[PDB]
Design a protein around this ligand. Structure first.
Ligand SMILES: [Mn+2]
Ligand SMILES: [Mn+2]
Lengths: 206, 206
């Protein structure tokens, strides 16, 4: 009830040849759906939380009943992260404008940022996410475990900041095409990171 | 150096039709190799710890420095776990003998244990392992995150006990064949869990 699997900005094959259509379909119809379903299941008993946007719910995980924290952290996190991820994917964009300049300001150069992002994405051990976040006035690359989001805050996720964009580095995001070669997937991410959406999120939050 | 990739006890396709040969090859030659490589790299500056069997090293994670604990927990963990995993996989075995009796004693029935194992393997959120462990004289089903091992102890891994067998539920262990259908993979594991080795391990620290 509370959450719905969001309508994608695109068909499953829209990120070809970079992100494989089989994975995008499963990622949405199976993995994301499951996060929505399991978050919804957990929120049935929590009407005072079920109304929150998922992105707000995950900032309030410390307010949930103890026995709800993990399931919603994982599944509302998964829902939030995947919802962001899809909107954060698009071919044909160019990093530009204020976001490019902020990246250049905060990382020294786009290449420095990319290397830092790639390093975070590659070094995330196990499942998780690499993020470009905005922490007040400064962009940062952080990473989170599993479906943790920086929106969850430091205490829960070990990261914080508003996610400008993120890269799913769960193996389900890349295994079918890339298998263990997560760096290749990370490189491909640069071809599909939706800088227009990242720029819009930066514009909203900067 | 410190660690080597062990030979598989079997050919890449020896677990077919249950576990796919492609995954077995990548899982062994890439993922396990990488754990070996990265554990070896981290041990290069740790002479005090570099000569230890991997299963002993992962019991001493709390003794290494902080810039080494995680890398070795993850990679020596991965090496320990995959080493066990390969030996713990074999077609044609039959659960029997003291191990079957102890499973029946501690879980009520083989099916009860299998259901509890499957639950633990399915509910492991993110990457990790499901374990049959022996805790003193009681078999238990536990799961660990990432490449944590029960051998690592409760503080680090959230689990303890002597692993009798384990199931890798990292998505790289099953995604190529099963994609998101980890329960199908978990069910297939019953066809390839090496009960002989599980029995041998059970007899070894019973
Ligand atoms: Mn995902
Ligand atoms: Mn594995």
């Amino acid at each position: 009830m509370s959450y719905t699997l969001p309508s994608l900005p695109y068909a499953y094959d829209a990120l070809e040849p970079h992100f494989d259509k089989q994975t995008m379909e499963i990622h949405h119809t199976k993995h994301h759906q499951t996060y929505v379903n399991n978050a919804n299941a957990a929120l049935e008993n929590l009407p005072e939380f079920a109304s929150l946007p998922v992105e707000e719910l995950i900032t309030k995980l410390d307010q949930v009943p103890a026995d709800k924290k993990t399931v919603l952290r994982n599944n509302a996190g998964g829902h939030a992260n995947h919802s962001l991820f899809w909107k954060g994917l698009k071919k044909g964009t160019t990093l530009q404008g204020d976001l490019k300049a902020a990246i250049e300001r905060d990382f020294g150069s786009v290449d420095n940022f990319k290397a830092e992002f790639e390093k975070a994405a590659a070094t995330r051990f196990g499942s998780g996410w690499a993020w470009l976040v905005l922490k007040g006035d400064k962009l940062a690359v952080v990473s989170t475990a599993n479906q943790d989001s920086p929106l969850m805050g430091e205490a829960i996720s070990g990261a914080s900041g508003f996610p400008i964009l993120g890269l799913d580095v769960w193996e389900h995001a890349y295994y079918l095409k890339f298998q263990n070669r997560r760096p290749d997937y990370i490189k491909e991410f640069w071809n599909v990171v939706n800088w227009d959406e990242a720029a819009a999120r930066f514009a909203a939050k900067k």
